[PDB]
Design a binder for this molecule. Structure first.
Ligand SMILES: Cc1cn([C@H]2C[C@H](O)[C@@H](COP(=O)(O)OP(=O)(O)O[C@H]3O[C@H](C)[C@@H](N)[C@H](O)[C@H]3O)O2)c(=O)[nH]c1=O
Ligand SMILES: Cc1cn([C@H]2C[C@H](O)[C@@H](COP(=O)(O)OP(=O)(O)O[C@H]3O[C@H](C)[C@@H](N)[C@H](O)[C@H]3O)O2)c(=O)[nH]c1=O
Ligand SMILES: Cc1cn([C@H]2C[C@H](O)[C@@H](COP(=O)(O)OP(=O)(O)O[C@H]3O[C@H](C)[C@@H](N)[C@H](O)[C@H]3O)O2)c(=O)[nH]c1=O
Ligand code: NA
Ligand code: NA
Lengths: 209, 209, 209
């Protein structure tokens, strides 16, 4: 396999370097814009430079190990023009990937995650630790599912959606592009574009855009 | 082992055909009453006919792969007279079954489920994806536990109880026959027969019968 | 390895004797102060006597298999003077222990638990069934994390903290010594010493001391 460059040397890049190692990948290093992180390491893996150095590593696969959906879209659209770069798909050895699971490139499926049957993910998705996607779930591009999220059958998550940790989504709910479900929310109604919903039962807090 | 007939070719029958395959079972097909599903398939497994065709497959094990507790009881009582048919017990290879676990026939224990010690399940139970039943939990017949439910020590769930996804039940709580706990509920008090409770903390919504 | 003495022959001692067996340990027996439990067994393992008999088993490792943080501290401080006894560290074979995980003695990591990277636990901690501790989480001494708890990145749990089942803690939250988070709580703010918080969103209920 190609060596891997991890974009983002924060909390998620920390866990994704761990994921990559468990997947048998060689991680060349991180790219990160943080001044203070230049010349630093996570567990023997160096921060190589800033994101505009990505063109020096076209031989590598990339992954954008940043939780914020909009951050991953912003980075892909600025630094990663269509067809110039390749992206890894990282699936933890302890994740369960069932039948007729379709996952597009750049996606991270973390330890203990379960995708049962007929689940479709777009590009640069995250399914974090111990989250569950039941039958017929569809994710767009740049979706973040946090640890322990409970995504019931036939839920649709649009592009740049974020589902917070240990939230629960009723079967057949649709969540439109750019929405955010707060950690622990219990969602029993469809969510409209860019809405932030929180609580039990989930209620509209604000729009994020 | 006997070949398997799955009653119900919906979302749960989809996941239970997956479970059966992972358990090394040969699935003969589904029975389903849906007109539009006659002559259809899930992943090479045909819908063979309607439920009244069950008498043509007495050579097979059956499982009732329908989430609603009352649906499974209704189907067993109409179509499956005592002692005429055999039922499979399906335990995902990634489920954890500990010590002194007693599971009666027709039960489905799904991927990532954990039953620790001294857990007793009656007939035709479901313990769905990544749910946990702690020490001394007792389930009656036709109990449905949804994905990620958190059933603490010494909880008692009566017959035809349903616990919604990622709900949490305090230790030593009793839930009487036919009750329903909504998804995400946090249950800290005993629940009476046929009560529907929802929320954090769970409150009585209505009676289901 | 040394044989093991389990202090506490209740629900948690039941599950920890199971854990010990799965870890390939020989359990000599339980110590328990309950009159009615003298001469009793859990799955072939006897209650040997009361806690003041611990000095007859200095050849053994001990574990304090009692959920209440304050109970474990009380027992260690009364019966287990510094340097007289050794404590087991029990990690279920199905727990995931990642990289740069530091766990001090007496700790129990239960089935399906996940500790990702840079997690630090003090002495006599519990991480129960299917709980998740994300990057940079720090636990003090005598912390109890209940089943399915969702402890996000960089959370700090002080000494004698208890996090209830399937609760969710926002990243970078600090919980000071002796606090309690109720089952199912959704914690988005720092918690002060000995505070009990419950609900979604978590609110102060009372002080425990
Ligand atoms: C948006 C953006 C970010 N970065 C860098 C800055 C930081 O070093 C890094 C982001 O690190 P961070 O720790 O602030 O955030 P993340 O690594 O995304 O972590 C977040 O999501 C995870 C899923 C959670 N587990 C964490 O608790 C949460 O803080 O990415 C860039 O280099 N360029 C960018 O354009
Ligand atoms: C009650 C009843 C049902 N059926 C058939 C009709 C349908 O094709 C099938 C039921 O399919 P369905 O998708 O409507 O429902 P289920 O397959 O039970 O799925 C439900 O529970 C699961 C645990 C959840 N994961 C799903 O999100 C939820 O929709 O069973 C029969 O053939 N006869 C019956 O008597
Ligand atoms: C405080 C104290 C207790 N004990 C004994 C008495 C009991 O037999 C035993 C405690 O048993 P118990 O069942 O009351 O409690 P625990 O074994 O701690 O169980 C509790 O925490 C677990 C994590 C949960 N899964 C259970 O649902 C919850 O009840 O310890 C002693 O022998 N000495 C002590 O000083
Ligand atoms: Na799990
Ligand atoms: Na949960």
């Amino acid at each position: 396999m190609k060596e891997l460059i991890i974009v983002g040397a924060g909390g998620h890049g920390n866990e994704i370097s761990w994921l990559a190692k468990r997947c048998g990948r060689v991680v060349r290093g991180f790219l990160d814009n943080t001044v203070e992180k230049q010349g630093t390491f996570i567990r023997d893996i160096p921060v190589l430079g800033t994101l505009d150095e990505c063109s020096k590593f076209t031989d590598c696969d990339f992954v954008i190990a940043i939780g914020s959906p909009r951050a991953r879209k912003k980075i892909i659209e600025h630094f990663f023009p269509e067809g110039e770069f390749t992206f890894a798909t990282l699936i933890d050895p302890t994740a369960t990937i069932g039948e007729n699971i379709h996952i597009e490139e750049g996606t991270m499926i973390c330890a203990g995650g379960i995708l049962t049957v007929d689940v479709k993910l777009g590009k640069h998705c995250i399914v974090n630790t111990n989250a569950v996607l039941s039958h017929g779930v569809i994710l767009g591009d740049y979706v973040t599912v946090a640890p322990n999220a409970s995504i019931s059958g036939d839920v649709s998550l649009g592009n740049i959606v974020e589902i917070g940790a240990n939230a629960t989504i009723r079967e057949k709910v649709s969540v439109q592009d750019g929405a955010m479900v707060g950690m622990g929310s219990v969602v029993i109604r469809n969510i409209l574009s860019n809405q932030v919903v929180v609580g039990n039962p989930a209620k509209l807090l604000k729009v994020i855009e």
